[PDB]
């Protein structure tokens, strides 16, 4: 996180059971998320 | 979890909910009202989100006697009404409770009131020559089976009488199921209609649903949707022909305008609510016949102060195919059906599918009436003595024809002692050809008023 953003970054973690794995980070408006459920839904919705 | 009430005004009520508890749009809500003598159960339907966990909605019951701080509960579901074969021969209100028996019909399956219009890929035009026993509709604007039919006109012109006569003439010769819906009308009319239907055996074959005008505007806006739900359920699964009659359409647009005045939206031209056309189009798309299923609908539309420039009638005209309107000038003249042929039109009237004689007769009579309407003012001012021979002959022929379109009906028995009379199509065609040829001009004025058949015309002629 300090590599991508020059300023130091604090950490606040919230435990979520819905996701089957992965990790998500939110630094404000920008968001990054890698989740099994999200990938499965994205693959399913583009099936045809 | 439950919310509270913070503001109350008119029919609109807004409520507050805790986090993660706001319901989606169009969800029923229940509220409790207590008093020494006024105890009820308020039913509300969600209208819009105001943010900050606040939702504003309307009510289907009078809001008299409510106090702030009363909890409001949610069912998490939409409005529903029981359906099935047992619905036949009963009277229901908007909410679906049976008015005849308080406990009847509380065990059938239930369907949500909100639905989706059928897809465009399954549309097919319907063309059929459906014939009644009335001269004007038979000749000028024939009705279409499985299509839209509607009326027009101001107050006190006689649309309800025509609807009653039409249903009396058709329901006796139908093998399908008919459903009657009353949006706005006096209670006396509904009671008399129920008694008249009970006078025969047809009541067991039809289902009635209606709400009156004294109720709050919430109820007047929802009866049509319930009627459409019942009709759609009957059509979709049974695969049977259905008949649908609507007393009025202006009423629910009026209710929408009233509620949108308070909801907080800006007004528009002639003080009408915005997006009225969208709602009208969304509702009117439900009544449609697919390739394998046919449904025939007859509607009546009211106009304010006989003004066709009003945006609402102009908008609702575009959804019709076969139309017949009424005028007040002909009513003041004396003719009872009071149908104006000049402006009315149909959508199956062409020699491609109809015999050419019909087309020729219609064109000739329309031209004659148009010429008479043109010569009106000169005849009134300078008098008949100023015109030439051709103009005088056309004036006499126009008078004869205009008198001849009148006809007595059975529904006039209560008002006049004359009994009913019905005439087929071919006889009317031949009679109109004879009249437009000009071989009946020797008869007096009164011989052509209130005449059913040609033999009746001859008998009246011998009576003077």
């Amino acid at each position: 996180l300090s590599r991508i953003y020059g300023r130091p970054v604090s950490v606040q973690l919230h435990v979520d059971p819905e996701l089957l794995g992965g990790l998500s980070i939110t630094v404000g408006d920008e968001v990054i998320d890698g989740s099994i459920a999200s990938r499965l839904a994205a693959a399913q919705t583009g099936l045809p | 979890t439950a919310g509270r009430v913070v503001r109350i005004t008119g029919p609109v009520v807004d409520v507050e909910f805790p986090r993660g508890s706001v319901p989606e749009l169009f969800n029923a809500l229940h509220a409790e009202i207590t008093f020494g003598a006024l105890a009820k159960t308020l039913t509300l339907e969600v209208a819009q989100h105001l943010g900050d966990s606040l939702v504003r909605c309307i009510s289907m019951q009078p809001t008299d006697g409510l106090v702030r701080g009363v909890e409001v509960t949610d069912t998490g579901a939409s409005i529903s009404v029981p359906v099935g074969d047992g619905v036949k021969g009963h009277v229901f209100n908007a909410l679906g409770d049976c008015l005849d028996d308080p406990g009847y019909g509380k065990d059938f399956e239930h369907w949500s009131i909100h639905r989706k219009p059928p897809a465009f890929s399954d549309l097919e035009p319907r063309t059929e020559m459906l014939e009644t026993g009335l001269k004007v509709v038979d000749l000028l604007t024939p009705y279409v089976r499985g299509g839209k039919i509607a009326l027009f006109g101001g107050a006190g012109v006689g649309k309800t009488v025509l609807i009653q006569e039409m249903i009396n003439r058709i329901a006796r010769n139908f093998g399908g199921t008919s459903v009657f819906a009353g949006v706005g009308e006096r209670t006396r009319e509904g009671n008399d209609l129920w008694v008249e239907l009970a006078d025969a055996n047809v009541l067991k074959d039809t289902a009635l649903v209606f709400g009156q005008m004294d109720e709050p505007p919430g109820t007047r806006m929802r009866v049509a949707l319930s009627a459409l739900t019942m009709a759609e359920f009957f059509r979709d699964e049974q695969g049977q022909d259905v008949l649908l009659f609507i007393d009025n359409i202006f009423r629910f647009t009026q209710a929408g305008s009233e509620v949108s005045t308070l909801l907080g939206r800006m007004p528009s031209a002639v003080g009408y609510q915005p997006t009225l056309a969208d709602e009208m189009g969304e509702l009117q798309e439900r009544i449609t016949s697919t390739r394998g299923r046919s449904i025939t609908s007859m509607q009546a539309v009211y106009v304010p102060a006989d003004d066709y420039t009003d945006p609402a009638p102009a908008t609702t005209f575009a959804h019709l195919d076969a139309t017949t309107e009424l005028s007040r000038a002909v009513f003041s003249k004396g003719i009872f059906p009071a149908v104006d042929p000049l402006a009315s039109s149909s959508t199956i009237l062409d020699p491609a599918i109809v015999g050419d004689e019909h087309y020729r007769v219609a064109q000739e009579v329309i031209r004659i009436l148009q010429r008479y309407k043109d010569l009106q003012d000169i005849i009134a001012i300078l008098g008949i003595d100023e015109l030439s021979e051709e103009d005088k002959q056309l004036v006499n022929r126009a008078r004869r024809i205009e008198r001849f379109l009148s006809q007595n009906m059975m529904a006039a028995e209560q008002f006049t002692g004359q009994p009913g009379s019905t005439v087929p199509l071919k006889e009317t065609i031949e009679a109109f050809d004879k009249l437009t040829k000009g071989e009946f001009d020797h008869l007096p004025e009164q011989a052509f008023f209130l005449i059913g058949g040609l033999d009746d015309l001859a008998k009246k002629a011998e009576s003077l």
Binding site: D29, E30, V31, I32, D33, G34, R39, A42, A43, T45, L47 | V22, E24, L25, F26, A47, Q48, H49, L50, G51, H114, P117, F120, S121, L123, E124, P125, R265, M266, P267, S268, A269, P274, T275, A277, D278, G281, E282, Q284, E285, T288, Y308, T309, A314, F317, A318, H319, D321, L342, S345, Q363, I366, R367, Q370, R371, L387, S388
Partner: protein
């Protein structure tokens, strides 16, 4: 199982090619909704008219900006919208996929195949908003764009690149004229090179689905379905589709025009679009004006109807023609939109209802209609044959107003009255019957020279028809000549005179009398 093998191969090829990337983007949240619009906050930088994306699959566009709020319009389904959803900024200004496989199909205003036919191919994406051709890339207008109607091309000619307007009252027959014009070009399509070929498009706004089905059936029976496409926005759709369809139609037509193929845009109705825009603007809480209309409404039309124009030979010499249709009520023209659209275009065709009530079926008014281009868009032969019958008709009606009750007149006055009555009775025509140029010229020449002045006015039309049929059967040289040289020769005139005389010698309707 060859089809099964193909299905399995396609499924395996798609599934083995799955790939995705982890990239950052800005996401905002909805704060309120209802009545077809919703408010979204949290998006730092979004272009105006951006195509947003919603978690449920519904779409939307951004119209109104603010310091801490963004307005939006929901296009498709609306009930899935609720507080708590997350929006995702995607892509850029919306566009339309245009190509050449759109022919003979019906598409969603957004570019989806609502028809029962399978999916369509795509060629290239074009954004709706682009600048119109400049003032230094146009030529003069000179081309005989036929219409198949005697009255229209006799009175008010139409050429390529010319915007012509049709304003009518309720139940008059505008759509019939439009359909006749749209299907008149079967013979033109049948020719080999695309110099005569025209690719036509149709747009339908705020109409019942059954009417669209009937129109499609009529066109299919006519056989012109092969070179046309339909865009449909029925009443069941939200306001967004009704607002946005004409831009899609114009862009699709413009792509064809830009590459050197002649096209023909037709707008079914413009009042509905104005009403939808007014509803959206009022719902977005913008200042109102006269007749509850926003100020910019006029500008709207100027942005849309001005796309079509003739091109120069440097860019390929394409063309585009528009036929907007306007509906007026109570025979009133002083209304806002009618005045604006009249002042923005050139050429008008008024459709009275009194004329349609009796007599003339086309029911086109003559004393008010006008065409700006005029003779610059005419054929030389029919221009010569025209003989300035406008003044003849004008003085004919003026005199026949007087002579209704007058029996003693000047002989020349009686002759002029009879000629005018004969021409008026000739000018009528039934529906679904287009006419080619040569028979129109022949009929007009027959009318002008006074050959039929001896024919009783009650049964002229039938007689005329018979003559035409006979002329088509036992004679073919005159048609070839008029097709090859586009001019009427004196010897052909003499031969036609002989044919007319010999045919009229042997025709009777009721106590008739063949005369010199």
């Amino acid at each position: 199982t060859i089809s099964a093998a193909d299905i399995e191969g396609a499924i395996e090829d798609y599934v083995s090619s799955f790939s995705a990337d982890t990239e950052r983007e800005e996401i905002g949240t909805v704060i309120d909704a209802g009545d077809g619009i919703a408010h979204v906050e949290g998006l730092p930088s979004v272009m105006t008219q951006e195509l947003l994306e919603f978690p449920g699959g519904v779409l939307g566009v951004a119209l109104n900006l603010d310091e801490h709020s963004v307005g939006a319009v929901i296009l498709g389904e609306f009930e899935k919208i609720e507080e708590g959803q997350q929006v995702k900024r995607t892509g850029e200004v919306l566009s339309v996929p245009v190509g050449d496989a759109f022919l003979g199909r019906v598409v969603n205003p957004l570019g989806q195949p609502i028809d029962g036919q399978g999916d369509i191919a795509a060629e290239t994406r074009r954004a709706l908003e682009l600048q119109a051709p400049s003032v230094v890339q146009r030529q003069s207008v000179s081309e005989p764009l036929q219409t198949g109607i005697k009255a229209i091309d006799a009175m008010t000619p139409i050429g390529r690149g010319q915007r012509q307007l049709i304003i009518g009252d309720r139940k008059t027959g505008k759509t019939a004229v439009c359909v006749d014009t749209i299907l008149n070009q079967r013979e033109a399509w049948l020719t080999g090179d695309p110099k005569q070929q025209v690719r036509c498009v149709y747009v339908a706004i705020g109409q019942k689905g059954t009417t669209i089905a009937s129109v499609k059936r009529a066109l299919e029976e006519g056989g012109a379905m092969e070179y046309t496409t339909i865009v449909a926005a029925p009443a069941s759709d939200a306001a967004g589709f009704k607002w946005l369809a004409p831009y899609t139609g114009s862009a699709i037509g413009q792509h064809w025009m830009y590459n050197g193929k002649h096209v023909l845009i037709v707008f079914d109705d413009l009042s509905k679009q104005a009403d939808a825009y007014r509803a959206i603007s009022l719902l977005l809480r913008r200042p109102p004006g006269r007749e509850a209309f926003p100020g910019d409404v006029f500008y709207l039309h100027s942005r849309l109807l001005e796309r079509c124009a003739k091109l120069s030979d440097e860019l390929g010499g394409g063309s585009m023609t528009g036929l907007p249709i306007i509906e007026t009520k109570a025979n009133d023209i002083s209304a806002f939109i009618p005045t604006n659209v009249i002042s923005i275009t050139d050429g008008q065709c008024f459709l009275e209802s009194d004329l349609f009530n009796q007599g003339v079926r086309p029911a086109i008014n003559v004393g008010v209609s006008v065409s700006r281009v005029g003779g610059a868009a005419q054929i030389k032969a029919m221009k010569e044959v025209a003989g300035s019958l406008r003044l003849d008709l004008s003085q004919y009606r003026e005199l026949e107003a007087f002579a209704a009750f007058a029996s003693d007149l000047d002989a020349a006055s009686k002759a002029q009255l009879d000629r005018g009555a004969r021409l008026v009775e000739l000018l009528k025509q039934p529906q679904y019957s287009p006419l080619a140029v040569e028979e129109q010229v022949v009929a007009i020449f027959l009318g002008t020279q006074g050959h039929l002045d001896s024919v009783p006015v009650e049964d002229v039309q039938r007689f005329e028809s018979e003559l035409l049929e006979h002329v088509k059967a036992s004679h073919s040289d005159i048609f070839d000549g008029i097709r090859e040289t586009k001019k009427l020769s004196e010897e052909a005139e003499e031969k036609l005179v002989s044919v007319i005389n010999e045919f009229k010698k042997g025709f009777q309707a009721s106590d008739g009398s063949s005369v010199v």
